[PDB]
Every structure is written in C-alpha cells, then in structure tokens.
Structure 1
Amino acid sequence: GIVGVGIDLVSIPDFAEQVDQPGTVFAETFTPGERRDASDKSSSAARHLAARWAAKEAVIKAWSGSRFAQRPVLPADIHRDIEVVTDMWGRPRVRLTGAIAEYLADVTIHVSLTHEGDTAAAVAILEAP
C-alpha cells in the first residue's frame, strides 16, 4: 500500500546562490567542498546537490502529507536525517536516521531525481506492506 507521495522542484540558481552562504541549514547536510562546488549555478555539483535537496523535500512531503490534520512530528533537524546516496551507476536511495527512521521502519522509499536547465526535481513514493 502507498503511505505517501511527494514531489519537489528546486531552482538551481537560487539553490546555488544560498548553498554556501553562512546562516543557512546547508552545512548540516553538505560538505564544505560540496557547498563550494555547488555555489556555481552552472556546475555539476549544483545540479546534483539541488536534486538531492529536492529529494529530501519530496520525502518530507510524502510522509507529512500522510498525516492530514495531525500535529507535525518531524524534528526541526529533519533535513539532516534524510540522506540521498547513489550507487556506482548513479541510482539513488534514501537513508534515514533519528525518529523518522523509526517511523518509516518497514516502509520502502522509492525515489527519483532529475534536472534540466535551471530546474531540479524529485518524487518520493512511500510504500508499506
């Protein structure tokens, strides 16, 4: 059964403008090299990191959206609890830590990432038996 669905679009130029700025959440998610590389809006790193950010948001949307009219239970640092990793061929998967890992124990997170020009996007479908 489907637990939740989420989609997110990210402006790659806006992302690049912010990703290496002090006073943002991004140090908690990304390395200083990643953040420096991603601060150029036409780089590989910007495109890829923006799509990773998109994927985190799509997961958060997918789970939160499953709890209509319920007080939120996602921790304030949720962005650093959801990691998008890739295998050697670039296939993505989501790794979790903290409370969300316990909430989504026994749930499969299907994710896909894409980018084009100034736009990155991701979709997440949460599925459980």
Structure 2
Amino acid sequence: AIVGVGIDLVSIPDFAEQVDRPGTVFAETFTPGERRDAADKSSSAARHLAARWAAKEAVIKAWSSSRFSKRPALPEGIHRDIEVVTDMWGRPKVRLSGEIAKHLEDVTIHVSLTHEDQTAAAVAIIEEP
C-alpha cells in the first residue's frame, strides 16, 4: 500500500536567491556551476533546478511522513542519500544511497515534477506491495 506522500511548492525567485549560498545541503545536491547558473532567476537553469529541488523535497517529506522516520528531525545524510535527477527528456529519476537506500530496498518511490512562471512543484508517493 501507500507508505508516504509528499507535495512541495518552490518559489523560483526565492530558490535562485538561496541556491548559490554556501552550504552542505545544496552542495550535496547540485554542482557549483549548476548553482551559479540557477542563481539567475530568469534562467532555464533556475526553473529546472527549482523543479528538481521541489521533487527532492517532496520525496523527503513523503519519507518523513512514513514509518521509516523514527525521529522528528531528519537523519544525518538524508540530503546526500536522496537525489532526484532528470534524463535528457526532463523526466525525474530517484537515486538512493547510504542508509536510505538500505532501508528502502523494498519500497517504490513515484515522483512527478512541474513548473511554470515563478513556481515549481512536485509530488512523491512511496509505496510497497
């Protein structure tokens, strides 16, 4: 059945203002070059990276809502252990590593992302047989 659900809305202008400020979470998510590019709120980079961020946040929220989260505070490494990339067609793919990959070996994570104008959004559904 369904294990967790998450939805996330991201302001593309707010994201652009934050994404290239030094810090481990964003450095663990995007490259310095990606972050420089996305700091321009009018850019394709800003729009597309904002949707990837929305997707990652939606997955983490779905995980935080699930039985797999034992404490209110997110576990160390979760932003390294959960990544959402897009193929050359814009379609999202979830990649897990570390402890998250270990614990979620037997669940599926569905994700969809979207954006328009100044807003990006994503939904994630974690599910098991």
Q: TM (normalized to structure 2)?
A: 0.90
Unaligned residue ranges in structure 1 (runs of 5+): none
Aligned residues: 129
Structure 1 window deviating more from structure 2 (25-34 vs 4-13): it is 25-34
Unaligned residue ranges in structure 2 (runs of 5+): none
Encode CA deviations 1:56-93: one digit per residue, 9 max, x unaligned: 11111111112399424742331222111222322111
Name the counterpart of 1:12. 12
Deviation at 1:117, TM superposition (A): 1.1
Q: Is the 8 A contact 2:63 2:69 kept in 1?
A: no
SS in 2 for 1:66: coil
Deviation at 1:115, TM superposition (A): 0.7
Structure 1 window deviating more from structure 2 (23-32 vs 98-107): it is 23-32
Structure 1 window deviating more from structure 2 (97-106 vs 30-39): it is 97-106
Q: Is the 8 A contact 1:18 1:24 kept in 2?
A: no
Encode CA deviations 1:79-117: one digit per residue, 9 max, x unaligned: 222111222322111000111111211111110011111
User: What is the distance in 2 between the residues matched to 1:108 and 1:23?
Assistant: 30
Name the counterpart of 1:79. 79
Judged with a 3 Å threshold, the aligned counterparts in structure 2 of structure 1 residues 73 and 43 are, in CA distance, closer, same or farther, namely same
Deviation at 1:21, TM superposition (A): 1.5
1:105 aligns with 2:105: yes
Structure 1 window deviating more from structure 2 (96-105 vs 63-72): it is 63-72
User: What is the distance in 1 between the residues matched to 2:99 and 2:73?
Assistant: 9
SS in 2 for 1:46: helix
Encode CA deviations 1:18-62: one digit per residue, 9 max, x unaligned: 111224631221111100100000111111111111111111111
Name the counterpart of 2:117. 117
Q: TM (normalized to structure 1)?
A: 0.90
Q: Is the 8 A contact 2:82 2:94 kept in 1?
A: yes
Judged with a 3 Å threshold, the aligned counterparts in structure 2 of structure 1 residues 64 and 40 are, in CA distance, closer, same or farther, namely same
